[PDB]
Amino acid sequence: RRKALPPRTEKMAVDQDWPSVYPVAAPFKPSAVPLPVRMGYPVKRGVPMAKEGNLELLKIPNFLHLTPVAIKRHCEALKDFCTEWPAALDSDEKCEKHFPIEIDTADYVSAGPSIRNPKARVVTLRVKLSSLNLDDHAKKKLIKLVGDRYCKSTDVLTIKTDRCPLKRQNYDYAVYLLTVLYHESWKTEEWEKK
Amino acid sequence: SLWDIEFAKQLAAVTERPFQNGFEEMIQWTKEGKLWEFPINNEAGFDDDGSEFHEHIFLDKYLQDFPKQGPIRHFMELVTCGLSKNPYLSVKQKVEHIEWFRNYFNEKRVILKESGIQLN
Amino acid sequence: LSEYAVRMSRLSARLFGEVARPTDSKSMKVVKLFSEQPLAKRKETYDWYPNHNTYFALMGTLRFLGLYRDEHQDFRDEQLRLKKLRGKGKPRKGEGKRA
């Protein structure tokens, strides 16, 4: 016994909300899509193939679950999770005098069973030297202490740590490097007098 | 106790239902652990035995059973500088390395004494 | 090159965690043997070939259980059956050369 059921197109309402049939990423089932779309290279006397049995419409990633109405309806319920950014830091001129420490953190995503990316341990530290309590001798010693990690044009010290396995460990180690580089710059030893 | 599990399976039988939405599919797969933890972080599930940076970078506390002024220090400071910049090895895995050196040098005593330099 | 710069670099290497005392380039190799993973430990080296035996035994057991249909093995069995019916089959181990 063979049965051939007509698709939902004959039953799809003209005013029915679209996000109800495509909530998440779907494989673009032609029975649930009421739009007649012809995809494929046409024949000299023919037309592009219809949506039924069309592998071309199945190879491409469909955005039927990300229409403007669905994204507006999604973010209207997502407005409750975020917080409001303080307007006291609208310009970076105040952000440099309030939060001079910058931590560049990298994150990656890839399709597959594994998540470990060896580029995730990299944590970059950027501090402007014009915002510290360095004296003349402490600064002139810290410059030669860091070397090429500190630039003279922009006057920004950069710390590039990759030795620790974990990102939190590389962050704590970069802050530890900042603490020791600020502290040991004030200690004047006996070999400095020569 | 078996009776609490037998009572929990009756709660699971009524709470479980066929999936009606792909959102509930990913909710259930995320609570079970199939879906990734969004937003995804490349260190999810790996804590490295809860160690910190002072367990990886600073390895001088393990060189106490070695001669301080001999060439053993000149040689082992290099393996410790390597283990400090080795992010692929754990704080436990570096320990059997330094212990393998501690065992080999303390096992081969005749060559270190016939080499002319004193080592303990 | 002055003593002040040698001492500054020696203390910078101490604070950053590099080699403190001057060592030769030939001896710097042992630092590299430990700073990176060896070749025989890499996932791209020791996990190069997948376990072909797992795939083969799984698919063959599934074919014997009746879920997978291996047309290649079925063709091999068809040709082997027709060869044994023709009369040139596989001799027994221990009687090919002598018997």
């Binding site: 530890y176 020791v180 | 600073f58 | 203390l11 005392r21």
Partner: peptide, 18 residues
């Protein structure tokens, strides 16, 4: 030649690096 004394344990106890 001459070697300088580096305070490692002191800096560790100071900056929580022990």
């Amino acid at each position: 030649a001459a070697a300088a004394a580096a305070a490692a344990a002191a800096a560790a106890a100071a900056a929580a690096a022990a």
